[PDB]
Symmetry: D2
């Protein structure tokens, strides 16, 4: 062809063998995206459930994904440590995840945001991180849940002072500046009479996705239709679970994830 | 946190400085996607125009993209050689392009496929290639257009034998197996009386996207000075947009016409 | 300076954290080097002991090297998995090892090759390989010893047919072409009456280097001097051991190497 | 083997094609090495000439090295931009240079340090840097010579205050702290009556190594034809060697004089 020599410029990005490959996604400028689409503070179920639906779609479409954790405007996908899906090329792991998720986001938008229209197609930021041991993999996942915890605890009391007390964002910020976790829990209990541990598990722990056995699916109808249909499905599908993954309780319960 | 040590495992993928960064996208399993959505053969305008709309969206949303070429189920995006958009990290260039494009694809689907419904959200394959000189960059782009040419010439006569002559895919394949470009051009002219050079430029050359100054003119009112200046005067509000162009980019004609792309 | 912008072109080559970093060295064109310096076939003690002395020098001079294995014209150096010696930059691991070894090679040449002069300064080929688990690290090391075994078994009978039987290299090659390990062991026992298992352990298993406690060193004098001197040394020094490292016997005996 | 799977863990470090590959070497802890071997201050010819001999050895032994610059305890080696010596693997460029140099250093030590014995085998630090254009390559090289200049100017007056004036290192440091190049040149001229520009070029500009055609002529005998051709005739046996040159490489004068280095 005389122009095919340009293929030799492509660099190799094979991920180290026998290691866990993790792809983390983050909504690009979602702060702006949440404002323009009237997101609920401190948490929006519509948004969080949509993210999970996209993540589920990424798991069924791509291969070798064992566990997936997502919180707020992000979602991590862990590929099997002995995978060889696309010769373990990093670029392939990032882009297939990032595009399938983004595609899914616009597709299933009507399923969660019925009344709120989608003004513009959003973008997503993705990366690949490689972990050699199962301990480092677990520690990464806990780091993600810990981050979910600290941020939700902060945001719940932060928007409480704004929506109920009527304080401005700058005032609510200084009021909570330098406060500890015990303090933030106390303020929610005394000034608003709200117990944090009684808040939804989805907002406190985030969502976790793992493969479990399934027999059939009864989908509800959503124009005057509201009856369940008989739809054939795969023998196994990724199911949402909002539990603690920092403790060993989760890994003892599901040992097939690391010992495959 | 005692868990933040996991950040040190992230590898650095900074692209060599002073080099062109090109991100190429390819629809994953689009052969299946074309069948399930009844794509026109050998070319579908609905599909190609949608791809361009997504590419345009990637160009307005992201930064420092100077030229973008897309053919069939792919699209390449060239970032400025002196860019520093995301500290030049490869992962950032790939994923932002790949997700914005994919997002756009489902979003603007009704604008091109009015009657045909979208059955499922598609996926895309992306990569990054780095080119040190302008020659290597040009050669990559021509390689893409050449590929467009060879494939369209083949597909036009390939589906001609199938839809008009009634031959099976396996028969049309053997008939064209070992034939040259001159031969394929001859068969189209004799058996179907169709001139290839008279086929749409979009199918033969593909689409190219460059920046162009597009101005919009509207009448504006005058509030000062008071001295007989309460009349109307025209005012041009110019905004730079990426405009489609289906021309040859292998020849120097294109680069002479638009020298700002390489000499920025 | 207006010329310091060239520093930004330097690429980062940090090795994945919590992984074993292994630097492997190979003599460049040592086939030519062995001919020009009259090396003994199928093995030369002078050469092998020199390589070990260089390796020992690399271990005392550099830091965090736990085990080092060398066979023939090569030597591997394993750095601690939790090291942070030079911010874990690959380039630093390769070059410091490669240069210190090469330096040492010319320096200590008179200590092993007394009568044979060094005609020219040799070169060495080096690389870095990263291993995530202890199993992959062990498997690499065994792969190196296995290679030592197969090659020595072949070379011993190969040079036997040449030096005793008088066969040409091309003839000895065809004679052993397609033969198994049991066959090569049989030919050595019948045609030359030489038992392979009674050959030096250094030639069969190669050399292994690990850190062990030391009190003092008695160096022998080598002009009419042949008396031992009292020289102060470090409390720990890398000692040669020619044993099997493929089996678990070695790792049970020395568990401090992997569990540090 | 059941153990060969460990080969798949080796990472690829191919340097971007069509780019200059530069390997820079630096003596590890040479500050200590200079003290223990009684190095002359502010400059030692024995040391600098040895470094050059090692660099020359690296150039003859390895392949595709076009220019090499070394100053003080370092030496840079530039490989051809279109090379394919070891499939352009970075690890190969670093280690072969680093070991050959180190080998050479101990080998040729007696050629320069006749009276001073080598107490211990030294080590060297090496790295690889990739440059896409010829401008960036030139700028790197000048950066190296500039560094040579600034440091020698400083060290000459720094050791002058110590060896002639008798000032302590800490005192000489404060005396020159905040001074400019013009100032340092003035102090050398007034207090010690020494003109910097009259100092050896090797210390001020450093050493540069380029390829040069060196021919050797010897008389050859003639055995044919028989017709009165049994006489003597001169015969030039030319062999290309890397020759030391202590000149300015920051200016264009050097590149005009030797254009084959960049336009190969």
């Amino acid at each position: 062809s005389k122009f095919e020599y340009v293929r030799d410029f492509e660099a190799d990005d094979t991920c180290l063998a026998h290691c866990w490959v993790v792809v983390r996604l983050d909504g690009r400028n979602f702060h702006r995206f949440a404002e323009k689409h009237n997101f609920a503070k401190p948490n929006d179920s519509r948004a969080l459930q949509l993210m999970t639906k996209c993540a589920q779609t990424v798991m069924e479409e791509l291969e070798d994904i064992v566990i997936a954790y997502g919180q707020s405007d992000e979602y991590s996908f862990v590929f099997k440590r002995k995978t060889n899906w696309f010769k373990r090329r990093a670029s392939k792991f990032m882009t297939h995840v990032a595009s399938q998720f983004a595609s899914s986001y616009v597709f299933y938008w009507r399923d969660y945001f019925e009344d709120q229209p989608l003004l513009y197609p959003p973008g997503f930021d993705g990366r690949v991180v490689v972990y050699p041991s199962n301990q480092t993999l677990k520690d990464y996942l806990s780091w993600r849940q810990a981050d979910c915890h600290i941020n939700n605890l902060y945001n719940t009391v932060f928007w409480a002072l704004i929506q109920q007390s009527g304080l401005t964002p700058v005032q609510a910020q200084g009021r909570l500046q330098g406060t500890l976790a015990a303090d933030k829990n106390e303020i929610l209990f005394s000034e608003f009479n709200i117990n944090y541990n009684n808040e939804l598990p989805m907002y406190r722990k985030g969502t976790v996705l793992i493969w479990q056995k399934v027999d059939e699916v009864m989908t509800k109808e959503i124009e005057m239709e509201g009856k369940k249909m008989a739809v054939t499905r795969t023998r196994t599908k990724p199911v949402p679970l909002h539990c603690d993954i920092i403790g060993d309780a989760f890994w003892k319960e599901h040992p097939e994830i690391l010992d495959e």
